[PDB]
């Protein structure tokens, strides 16, 4: 069956693990345990196609930035996550996109911009600002909440649909 290699990237604490675990395991991780690098696999049907999602949950702590090159080489599609209550995390997106662009030597890498924690009211990144960033990258913007599950499947499945346009 077709396999899709997804990689979830973004600053520390934005909810990469919580999103991935919500998708794969259907529960919300409330506690905060920083990730080094974990892998998840699951067979799922997306638009009629049985496929295997292979998902890499990466480190947001800058200490582990040396590991990015390796996972960017291997990944087919990138979920670029910030939190809508973390302006700095939104600004950090560009450094991830730029490295992906270098490593892939490509301006057309399958990606989806994700504004997570949309259940929280302390928003400092408005939808339109993120829409604009995604537009400049040629990619979709989707808001999510790992806590409520809002948008979670949509974000990951959209990334599969972007890889398929590639
Ligand atoms: N309210 C709310 N809290 C969230 C959401 N996603 C994550 N959190 C919380 O934010 C904290 C960090 O989540 P986590 O998934 O561990 O972030 P991370 O991006 O994987 N961290 P790291 O980069 O260090 O591995 C946790 O306490 C988690 O419960 C969300 O959608 N809504
Ligand atoms: Ca829980
Ligand atoms: Ca692009
Ligand atoms: Mg994590
Ligand atoms: Mg503002």
Swiss-Prot record:
Changing residue 37 to G: No effect on interaction with PLCE1. Changing residue 61 to V: Strongly increased transformation of cultured cell lines. It is a lipid-anchor. Palmitoylated by the ZDHHC9-GOLGA7 complex. A continuous cycle of de- and re-palmitoylation regulates rapid exchange between plasma membrane and Golgi. S-nitrosylated; critical for redox regulation. Important for stimulating guanine nucleotide exchange. No structural perturbation on nitrosylation. It is an enzyme of class 3 (hydrolase). NCBIfam families: small_GTP. It is linked to Costello syndrome: A rare condition characterized by prenatally increased growth, postnatal growth deficiency, intellectual disability, distinctive facial appearance, cardiovascular abnormalities (typically pulmonic stenosis, hypertrophic cardiomyopathy and/or atrial tachycardia), tumor predisposition, skin and musculoskeletal abnormalities. This is GTPase HRas. It comes from Homo sapiens. The lineage of its organism: Eukaryota, Metazoa, Chordata, Craniata, Vertebrata.
């Amino acid at each position: 069956m077709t396999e899709y290699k997804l990689v979830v990237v973004g600053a520390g604490g934005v909810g990469k693990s919580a999103l991935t675990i919500q998708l794969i395991q259907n529960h919300f991780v409330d506690e905060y345990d920083p990730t080094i690098e974990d892998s998840y696999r699951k067979q799922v049907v997306i638009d009629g196609e049985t496929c295997l999602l292979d998902i890499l949950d990466t480190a947001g702590q800058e200490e582990y930035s040396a590991m990015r090159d390796q996972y960017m080489r291997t990944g087919e599609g990138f979920l670029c996550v910030f939190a809508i209550n973390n302006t700095k995390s939104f600004e950090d997106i560009h450094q991830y996109r730029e490295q992906i662009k270098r490593v892939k030597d490509s301006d057309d890498v399958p990606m989806v911009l994700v504004g997570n924690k949309c259940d929280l009211a302390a928003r400092t990144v408005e939808s339109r600002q993120a829409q604009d960033l995604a537009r400049s990258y040629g990619i979709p913007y989707i808001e999510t909440s790992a806590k409520t599950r809002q948008g979670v499947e949509d974000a990951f499945y959209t990334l599969v649909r972007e890889i398929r346009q590639h």
